Amino acid sequence: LTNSEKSRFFLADLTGEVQSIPNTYGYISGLGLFRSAPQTQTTFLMDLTDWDISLLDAVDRTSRKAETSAPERVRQISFPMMYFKEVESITPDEIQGVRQPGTANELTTEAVVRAKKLMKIRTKFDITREFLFMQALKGKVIDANGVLYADLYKQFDVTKKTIYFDLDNPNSDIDAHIEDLRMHMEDEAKTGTVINGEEIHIVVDRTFFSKLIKHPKIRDAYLAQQTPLAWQQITGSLRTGGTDGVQAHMNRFYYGGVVFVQYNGKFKDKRGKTHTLVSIDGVSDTNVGVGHAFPNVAMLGEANNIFEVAYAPCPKMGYANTLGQELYVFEYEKDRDEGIDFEAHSYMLPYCTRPQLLVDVRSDAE
Amino acid sequence: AYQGFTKLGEREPLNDIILWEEITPTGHSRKEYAPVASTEYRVGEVLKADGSKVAAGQEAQADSVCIVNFYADLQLSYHGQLKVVGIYRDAELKDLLKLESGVDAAAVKSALKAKGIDFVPTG
Amino acid sequence: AYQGFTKLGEREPLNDIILWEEITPTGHSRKEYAPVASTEYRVGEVLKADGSKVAAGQEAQADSVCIVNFYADLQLSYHGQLKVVGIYRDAELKDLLKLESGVDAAAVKSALKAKGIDFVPTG
Numbered sequence: 001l002t003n004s005e006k007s008r009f010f011l012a013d014l015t016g017e018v019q020s021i022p023n024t025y026g027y028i029s030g031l032g033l034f035r036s037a038p039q040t041q042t043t044f045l046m047d048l049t050d051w052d053i054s055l056l057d058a059v060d061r062t063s064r065k066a067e068t069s070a071p072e073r074v075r076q077i078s079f080p081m082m083y084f085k086e087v088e089s090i091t092p093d094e095i096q097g098v099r100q101p102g103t104a105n106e107l108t109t110e111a112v113v114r115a116k117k118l119m120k121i122r123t124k125f126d127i128t129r130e131f132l133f134m135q136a137l138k139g140k141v142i143d144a145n146g147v148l149y150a151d152l153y154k155q156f157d158v159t160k161k162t163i164y165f166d167l168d169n170p171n172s173d174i175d176a177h178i179e180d181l182r183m184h185m186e187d188e189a190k191t192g193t194v195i196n197g198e199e200i201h202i203v204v205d206r207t208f209f210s211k212l213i214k215h216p217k218i219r220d221a222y223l224a225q226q227t228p229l230a231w232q233q234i235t236g237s238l239r240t241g242g243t244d245g246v247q248a249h250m251n252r253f254y255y256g257g258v259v260f261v262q263y264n265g266k267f268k269d270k271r272g273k274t275h276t277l278v279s280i281d282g283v284s285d286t287n288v289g290v291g292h293a294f295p296n297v298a299m300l301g302e303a304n305n306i307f308e309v310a311y312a313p314c315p316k317m318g319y320a321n322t323l324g325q326e327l328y329v330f331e332y333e334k335d336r337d338e339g340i341d342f343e344a345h346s347y348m349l350p351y352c353t354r355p356q357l358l359v360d361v362r363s364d365a366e
Numbered sequence: 367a368y369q370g371f372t373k374l375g376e377r378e379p380l381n382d383i384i385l386w387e388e389i390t391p392t393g394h395s396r397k398e399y400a401p402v403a404s405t406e407y408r409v410g411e412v413l414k415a416d417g418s419k420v421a422a423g424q425e426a427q428a429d430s431v432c433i434v435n436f437y438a439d440l441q442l443s444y445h446g447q448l449k450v451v452g453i454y455r456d457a458e459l460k461d462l463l464k465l466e467s468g469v470d471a472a473a474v475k476s477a478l479k480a481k482g483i484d485f486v487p488t489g
Numbered sequence: 490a491y492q493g494f495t496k497l498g499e500r501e502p503l504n505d506i507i508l509w510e511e512i513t514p515t516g517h518s519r520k521e522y523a524p525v526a527s528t529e530y531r532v533g534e535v536l537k538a539d540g541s542k543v544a545a546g547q548e549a550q551a552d553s554v555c556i557v558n559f560y561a562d563l564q565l566s567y568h569g570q571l572k573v574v575g576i577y578r579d580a581e582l583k584d585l586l587k588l589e590s591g592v593d594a595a596a597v598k599s600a601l602k603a604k605g606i607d608f609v610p611t612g
Contacts, residue, residue: 149370
């Protein structure tokens with residue numbers, strides 16, 4: 001029961017309230033790829049040791065001559081970490097007099113405002129974490145502003161690998177490119193163990209997935225099948241799996257021993273420019289599809305995990321030299337009952353210890 | 367860093383290049399030098415008679431091969447020794463050689479081979 | 490060493506210079522600086538608005554007191570940060586300033602005095 005329009009003396013009804021929460025994506029965060037590695041200091045080091053092998057050259061017996069092998073190579077690297085701080089304040093003049101949306105004549109309290117502010121802060125930090133994880137998956141950790149914090153390829157002295165699927169050409173060998181991507185991980189892992197290249201994640205965008213599932217070779221291959229998989233993929237829901245941040249079921253496609261998942265995650269920064277999670281810095285031709293292939297968790301084993309995220313303490317008066325945390329929230333009151341201050345801190349870095357395994361994928365031809 | 371990568375350095379070469387040497391009570395193939403000026407020695411660098419590294423055009427006067435890691439700032443070796451020791455007599459080292467800029471290896475190897483230092487192939 | 494002593498340097502100054510500052514959500518008294526190439530920053534040195542140290546004859550250009558230990562060649566601070574941070578606005582500091590050669594204390598202190606910085610005597 002609130003004042004009607006046009007007249008302050010007659011009444012109308014206020015049925016309810018509709019809200020438009022922004023879309024948020026958390027696929028990479030929910031994947032569980034980046035194991036948590038709490039940290040005490042502000043920087044962490046790492047030792048890199050490797051050796052090489054060669055073939056013996058035949059040497060004659062009577063002239064007693066031999067061969068030798070080069071010694072090992074040991075290096076060391078260091079990592080800085082990003083600090084995120086976000087401040088929010090509550091004041092009496094945004095509570096006094098202001099009316100609670102969706103209600104006729106009841107007033108906003110401090111509790112609802114505080115709850116909504118904290119929820120927005122936590123959501124912002126979650127989407128920032130997801131964007132950082134995706135950037136680390138790309139192999140280069142670029143901040144939303146654009147500043148470089150850790151270039152994994154130069155740090156480990158490796159070169160990025162990209163594969164051109166050439167989905168436009170009807171005669172393209174999809175099997176050949178899939179096999180190349182599959183064998184690249186096995187060849188460049190160099191962990192000393194036995195690698196299974198079929199255990200990888202291939203995350204592509206909308207255009208790449210559309211061009212892949214509509215290729216004449218793939219469709220003609222799956223149409224001439226009498227298996228339930230082909231029936232589902234051709235005439236059926238292409239949305240198995242999922243539980244994405246927005247959609248309940250992500251698009252995925254089985255062609256070889258690998259799967260292609262379509263990820264639509266995108267965010268905006270303060271400047272207004274959008275940040276598509278599945279993208280290549282530089283490419284924007286609109287008609288080319290891009291993707292990112294990274295090793296599965298169960299490929300190198302749990303003993304050799306390559307996806308870790310660090311956390312170090314905030315610079316507060318009593319948190320020094322302690323284990324890091326996902327997020328710190330602090331309550332500070334303004335003097336003279338003038339309001340309440342909020343601060344949120346998070347000091348993290350996602351990184352990959354084997355950046356060579358992060359393989360890029362494109363839909364155009366080289 | 368502002369450049370994107372921080373490389374704290376590479377481990378200095380280990381004293382493992384020696385495969386065989388004339389083992390004698392006082393040491394036969396090893397001689398000690400006076401560390402000249404502010405000079406950073408490492409394992410496998412070819413030295414002259416005075417103690418400085420061989421430079422381009424000075425290959426014929428190759429006197430020995432350094433087998434210690436010296437530090438100019440500390441004026442001490444990596445084992446806390448006051449002098450720098452090289453290999454100048456009958457011995458057999460590996461191909462690992464820290465040559466200077468613009469100095470050919472073949473002239474250095476032949477000069478060392480004249481004194482009885484042999485180099486083995488390394489894979 | 491060959492000089493008889495092997496002093497390995499002294500500990501870099503700690504960030505205990507700050508005694509009081511206008512504590513504010515977004516760092517009222519803190520200022521960011523893009524580090525100048527090949528320049529060592531320590532806690533206590535005075536910097537111009539450009540980012541370099543206050544040389545002789547330009548004490549009136551003093552802007553801030555650096556409170557980070559930058560490592561130039563590393564291009565990272567001693568806390569793994571990317572930029573040099575110094576205090577310039579209202580604050581109270583210990584009387585520990587690392588002025589350059591030929592730089593008088595009085596003009597530097599009075600230049601920072603107008604900014605709002607006070608120096609508590611130390612013994």
